[PDB]
Design a protein around this nucleic acid. Structure first.
Ligand SMILES: [Zn+2]
Lengths: 507, 351, 85, 351
DNA sequence: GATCTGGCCTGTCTTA
DNA sequence: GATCTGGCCTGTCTTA
């Protein structure tokens, strides 16, 4: 109990310069109730939510103070002289926030709280160096397996329904405030014996599309304006596919809201929503214009599942299928995927059944179902196209691991879209799933910009959710008051490197 | 003096703990809703129709020349009555944005056109405020006054977030009563005058204001410093003269102790205070009647409609006044699975 | 009992036959000691008094025919109270 | 030749993989309900009607005279047609009850009264059997023969549980082909004679029997010992002469390889054989027409209905014949969430 | 025209 | 009579 006092936040001393805005200077603060001073008067908007959060900065300096070991061994490996050139660091932090349903409430005392729980976390992707000047920025430490639940650092733990915005922004407000206040100031830590300075670059990449949309003020999730990154409408992204240019970014969305509200040109609702390209709400958080890998995979997988379902019977031959046949087609498709490929039907489709489904030999068991020969060849060819473009955004860093697929991705997508609007048009005339568009349009651009994608995936969040369930049973207190406190703490302890180092046992 | 139980029919996910009911030119419209507006009705304002127990909510569409509004939580509504040149006005300021913030911008909301079949287009108009602007706030009250014979407006009370210098991410969500200065806002132009009060040594909130004939009565409200709910009612009297809008005030000995009260107009100026919370736990059941005359405020209790055991035991309740001595109340509900409707409703009427 | 239900030597009608065999329509595959279960007894009576409480909040025996709405309402005030105290 | 899809409407939870359709006096009755009879219909038998694609099951009600029957799964059904004394009978023996045991008791099922309104009461008369009782078995078949002019029945084939010596709670649930001895059962009295023949080396299972004019043809069944599906067609000729039912037999050149076949009578004695399976893995799609005459049985394949890809790819399938060249087939279905209804249906018809 | 039966649809109960 | 607009249902889509 007194052994981990170090590993938790609110231990190691640190300071910012210039001093942070609107944040206290006390560095000893540990787990804080995230309500953060709600007066909880009956007369006001009630406080229905329990939460716990580290003060963001403290969680950071503890994470990094825990990476002290690996950045010193890294520095030594580089043979970059450790004592000199210590002030020019650059820290790139991936943060992610995702919700979770069906968490049963506790009888407890109070207050009343909804079932759903939201887990706000982050992970340190890399830490690099620049000075004296000259060369670039220089990597030192880079997380080798970001997707692992081993490194995801929980920060804010809440019981909140994703749907209510009021409360979500009420609790996550302070956290965002320390972030945008923090981007300006550089950190000072005492590490390796010496006082050194860090710059932080925050990329929230891990959010699912519905959350990105809802914090950015967009209309979710099936609205005429599909691309979070582009201004394209539904039908406009129907005719043209492979050619698009990323526009949507934070400041632009803010200014676009101020237009939507203030409304100087006095257009009617329809036309106004046309002018701002569908920003109906003031976003609060800033989010990198990037694409989640996981949901992308699941989206395309379910679209191909649907295409399969339609090819089993003949849809383009008779355009208006009965409902009974709709189920009959599902029944024989899942029959097949059981007898071959060893797969069983799902309600919501997990990404694992997406990895079994996406393979070519999986498309083989279905190719046998469709009577037509050229159709049989068409969807097969489609799937091989998809296998060729998938590792680009799935793999961590395609610039090395899979170069040729990357360079050919634009052309390959062109080919793909052509084949769709060619034989499948009936199902893509005026409608395209958000992800098929996103994956056929903005991928080469973002891979060119971030350098890589899928390393930034929601997976490194999400997975962590598993823990949150077991840590809510095994390691819980258990009563409503203390429970989030000790889950959060124990989670933090699970994530720390210092311990995992020990548990490697050095070969 | 009675209550009919109301069904929320479809779509009861809109109503939220604080909200507002705008009664202008017949039908009353609901204002404010959970989260950000949804495409179904992007405006954020619904017309409300109550027929055969059914509570039905309809989409309202703004005029092209009008600004669009965020679903404010607990703003200060001032209903400005018909006169030159443009009836009927609703002054809304400034509430709390669903994205959690305080809006300091004042809006003038009104009626535009109809029907052709039963459709009322509306127009919202921002007003630039030349100031000496009011600090952004919620729970405050605003009221329309006429003196000799020009018209201005009086703004006071409510809370605001901790001063931006002293607000720490731990104490962020903490909130303090804004300083006791009254803001006299001319409708046009945007001149906003801030005025100190020797008689008021403290600020307050959720104080229901009743304004008649160049005089404004502030019924008791929750004060956050001493956590007391003063029985004392506070009257003020505004002097508008060229070119100085000088302001006097006075304390009234005894009045009702209430917070978050619903004032439902009945007679000409006679509103019944429908109740609210008397203390930090117990909620006022007693339904009270209020006339306002030049002599003074005339206050008589009235026999409250008998409450169903549910609303009698309800932890909290809220609502709005549909006017014409008719008002709405809402009771939060539990069960499992979700009802879905988080709020049962009742409609109360007088006589 | 089952053998009577099947053979049915008295050529008796179904409605009344069921009375004679007193509820046995099938051949039992296992012997269980004629004994009560504690747990589901506790849950059965618990949920019963939950029901009686619920009907008792509003006045059921004065007006015998409640609707869906007053019932759901009764449940709401009940659960709200049980939580509150 | 045609097939069309059937919606099972309400209550499609009654059909289990083996079951039996009893075609007598027009309307056909489903039999072999899943599990034990539920007092929705305590009887256990269902009138089945197929209208405009809808498959509806009605609850039959036994006469007071009747014994009640357990939902046997795979019994030997022998239709005995109309003549003196009391037409027309369906001989069911013995199948296996929803608990695991084999009845080994013959039941005679007959029609009784109608309607009043579209109602059919039935009566089951169990008959005692002295012998030389038939060993408890299932999957066996039974047939009706008439020799000058006495009517008797022929009972042969089928699996049974391992005898109570080899019987072991590890091997308890194993089955084995019961020995090849034909049982001649007089309808009344209950004398059951057991004969064997050198021509019959082994016992079979699910071998579809056709019976006409004192001659019985067993199609190739499934032999469990050598695991063959004999293409040898079996014939036997019985004649009852006082006081012994003398019996003979012959093997045939060519016979079908199929197990669990569905025989739908169309012509006088001409049947359409659908077949359930060619082999262990792969089911038979081919439809065949089988007529029979005094000279012999003559086989002609007719073009099978074009199968929907589902039933062509379905691992298992079954059904029954509604008679009059009309039959029902059933396809198990995997879907999630549960359909719930487990079986799609198709109605098939000839010419 | 009007029974009877079965029907569905409702509609409550009891165990789970 | 017969528009309008909304209203609900339905209808598929589209996200989680
Ligand atoms: Zn785009």
């Amino acid at each position: 109990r007194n052994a981990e006092k170090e590993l938790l936040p609110g231990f190691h001393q640190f300071e910012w310069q210039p001093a942070l805005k609107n944040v206290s200077t006390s560095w000893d603060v540990g787990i804080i109730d995230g309500l953060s001073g709600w007066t909880v008067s009956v007369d006001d908007v009630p406080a229905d939510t329990i939460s716990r959060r580290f003060r963001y900065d403290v969680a950071l300096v503890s994470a990094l103070k825990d990476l002290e070991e690996d950045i010193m061994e890294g520095l030594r490996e580089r043979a970059l002289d450790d004592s000199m050139c210590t002030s020019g660091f650059t820290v790139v932090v991936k943060e992610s926030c995702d919700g979770m349903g069906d968490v049963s409430e506790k009888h407890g005392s109070g207050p009343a709280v909804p079932e759903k729980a939201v887990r706000f976390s982050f992970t340190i992707m890399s830490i690099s160096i620049r000075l004296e000047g000259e060369d670039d920025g220089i990597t030192i430490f880079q997380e080798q397996k970001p997707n692992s639940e081993l490194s995801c650092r929980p920060l804010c733990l809440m019981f909140v329904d994703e749907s209510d915005h009021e409360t979500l922004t009420a609790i996550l407000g302070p956290v965002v405030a320390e972030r945008k206040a923090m981007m300006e100031s550089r950190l000072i830590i005492s590490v390796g014996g010496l006082l050194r300075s860090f710059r932080f670059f925050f990329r929230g990449t891990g959010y699912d599309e519905k959350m990105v949309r809802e914090m950015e003020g967009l209309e979710a999730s099936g609205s005429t304006y599909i691309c979070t990154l582009c201004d394209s409408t539904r039908a406009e992204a129907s005719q043209n596919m492979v050619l698009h240019s990323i526009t949507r970014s934070h400041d632009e969305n803010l200014e676009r809201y101020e237009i939507w509200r203030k409304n100087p040109f006095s257009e009617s609702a329809d036309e106004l929503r046309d002018r701002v390209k569908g920003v109906s709400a003031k976003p609060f958080m800033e989010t990198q214009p990037t694409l989640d890998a996981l949901h992308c995979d699941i989206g395309n997988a379910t679209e191909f599942y649907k295409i399969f379902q339609d090819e089993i019977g003949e849809v383009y031959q008779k355009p208006n299928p009965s409902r009974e046949e709709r189920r009959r087609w599902r029944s024989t498709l899942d029959k097949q995927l059981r007898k071959k490929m060893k797969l069983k039907p799902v309600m919501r489709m997990n990404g694992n059944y997406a990895r079994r489904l996406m393979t070519r030999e999986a498309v083989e068991a279905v190719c046998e179902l469709v009577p037509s020969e050229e159709r049989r060849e068409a969807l097969l060819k489609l799937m091989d196209l998809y296998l060729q473009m998938k590792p680009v955004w799935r793999s961590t860093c395609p610039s090395r691991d899979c170069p040729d697929q990357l360079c050919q991705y634009s052309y390959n997508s062109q080919q793909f879209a052509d084949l769709l609007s060619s034989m499948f048009k009936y199902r893509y005339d005026g409608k395209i799933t958000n992800y098929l568009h996103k994956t056929l349009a903005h991928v080469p651009e973002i891979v060119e910009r971030d350098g890589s994608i899928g390393a930034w995936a929601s997976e490194g969040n999400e997975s962590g959710n598993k823990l949150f369930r077991r840590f809510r049973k095994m390691n819980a207190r258990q009563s409503k008051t203390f429970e989030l406190e000790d889950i959060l703490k124990h989670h933090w302890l699970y994530t720390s490197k210092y311990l995992q180092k020990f548990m490697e046992a050095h070969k | 003096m009675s209550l009919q139980p109301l069904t929320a029919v479809n779509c009861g996910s809109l109503v939220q703990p604080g909200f507002s009911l705008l009664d202008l030119e017949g039908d009353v419209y609901l204002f404010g809703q959970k989260g950000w507006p949804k495409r179904s009705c992007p405006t954020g304002i619904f017309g409300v129709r109550i027929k055969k127990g059914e509570l039905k909510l309809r989409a309202i569409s703004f005029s092209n020349n009008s600004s669009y509004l965020p679903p404010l939580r607990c703003p200060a509504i001032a209903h400005f009555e018909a006169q030159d040149g443009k009836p009927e006005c609703y002054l809304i300021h400034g509430g709390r944005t669903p994205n959690n913030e305080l809006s300091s911008s004042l809006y003038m909301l009104s009626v535009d056109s109809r029907g052709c079949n039963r459709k009322v287009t509306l127009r919202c108009e921002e007003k630039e405020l030349v100031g000496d602007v009011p600090s952004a706030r919620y729970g405050h009250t605003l009221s329309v006054i006429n003196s000799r014979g020009k018209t201005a407006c009086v703004l006071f009370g409510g809370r605001s977030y901790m001063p931006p210098t002293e607000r720490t991410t731990q104490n962020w969500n903490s909130v303090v009563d804004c300083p006791p200065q009254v803001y006299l806002i001319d409708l046009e132009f945007g001149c906003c005058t801030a005025h100190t009060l020797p008689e008021l040594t403290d600020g307050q909130s959720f104080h229901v204001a009743l304004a008649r004939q160049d005089c404004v009565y502030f019924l008791g409200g929750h004060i956050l410093s001493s956590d007391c709910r003063p029985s004392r009612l506070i009257r003020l009297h505004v002097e508008l003269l060229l070119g100085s809008p000088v302001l006097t005030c006075t304390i009234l000995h005894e009045g009702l102790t209430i917070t978050s009260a619903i004032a439902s107009p009945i007679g000409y100026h006679e509103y019944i205070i429908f109740g609210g919370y008397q203390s930090e736990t117990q909620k006022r059941m007693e339904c009270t009647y209020v006339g306002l005359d030049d002599v003074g405020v005339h206050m008589e209790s009235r026999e409250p409609p008998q409450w169903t055991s549910e609303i009698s035991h309800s932890r909290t309740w809220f609502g709005g006044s549909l006017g014409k001595g008719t008002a709405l109340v809402a009771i939060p509900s539990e069960g499992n699975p979700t009802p879905p409707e988080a709020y049962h409703f009742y409609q109360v009427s007088f006589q």
